[PDB]
Amino acid sequence: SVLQVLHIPDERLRKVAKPVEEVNAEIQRIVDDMFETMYAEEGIGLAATQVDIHQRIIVIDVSENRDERLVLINPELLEKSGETGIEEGCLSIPEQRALVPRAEKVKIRALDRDGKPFELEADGLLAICIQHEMDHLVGKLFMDYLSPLKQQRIRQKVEKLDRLKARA
């Protein structure tokens, strides 16, 4: 199923996700729906809290052929280093982009779709995406890193997008 993606300024985007207790068939359905939603909306990452499911589940695909599914359940950041920034987008802040300070290199531990633990070292685009998605799970958005004026301009542009999408 394709789930509805929340937009700012929805306050559900600010909730802190709980850890997944057990990777069972219910969790695997959520993971599969989240991929289906992410590809439908043409994103490269999606966190459960964006679809109003407040558990620590992220899906990512940064591949050119869109055939490289990465699942992070209960991710934990072990190490990071360096600093970078790319103009980031977000399905919850549609059509807006802004440079945000990130670590350049990241090492994480997570469970996969089978609930098996794995470690992953990432740099480049992948490292940035993982950090962006992990921020969601604690209720943080990329606009939070920006000045109060930039934050206001972004909120306003999104509220205008959505007015028109809703046209009676």
Report the partner that residue 90 touches, choosing among a second copy, Ni ion, none (CB closer than 5 to 8 A by kind).
Ni ion
CA 36, 166, 13, 79 torsion-angle sign: positive
- Would you say 7 and 52 are in contact if contact means Cβ atoms under 8 Å apart? no
Residue 26 interacts with a second copy (CB under 8 A): yes or no: yes
Give the separation between CA 26 and CA 57, rounded to whole angstroms. Answer: 12
Report the partner that residue 22 touches, choosing among a second copy, Ni ion, none (CB closer than 5 to 8 A by kind).
none
Give the separation between CA 86 and CA 102, rounded to whole angstroms. Answer: 9
Stretch that binds a second copy, among 19-27, 82-90, 115-123, 141-149 (CB under 8 A): 19-27
Residue 137 interacts with Ni ion (CB under 5 A): yes or no: no
Residue 126 interacts with Ni ion (CB under 5 A): yes or no: no
Candidate list 9, 10, 29, 121; residue touching a second copy; CB under 8 A: 29
CB of 76 to a second copy, least distance (A): 6
Q: What are phi and psi of 118, to 5 degrees?
A: -150, 155
Give the separation between CA 49 and CA 60, rounded to whole angstroms. Answer: 14
- Residues after which a C–N gap over 2.5 Å breaks the chain: none
The residues that touch a second copy, with contacts defined as CB under 8 A, are 1-4, 16-17, 19, 24-26, 29, 33, 40, 51-53, 56, 64-67, 74, 76, 137-138
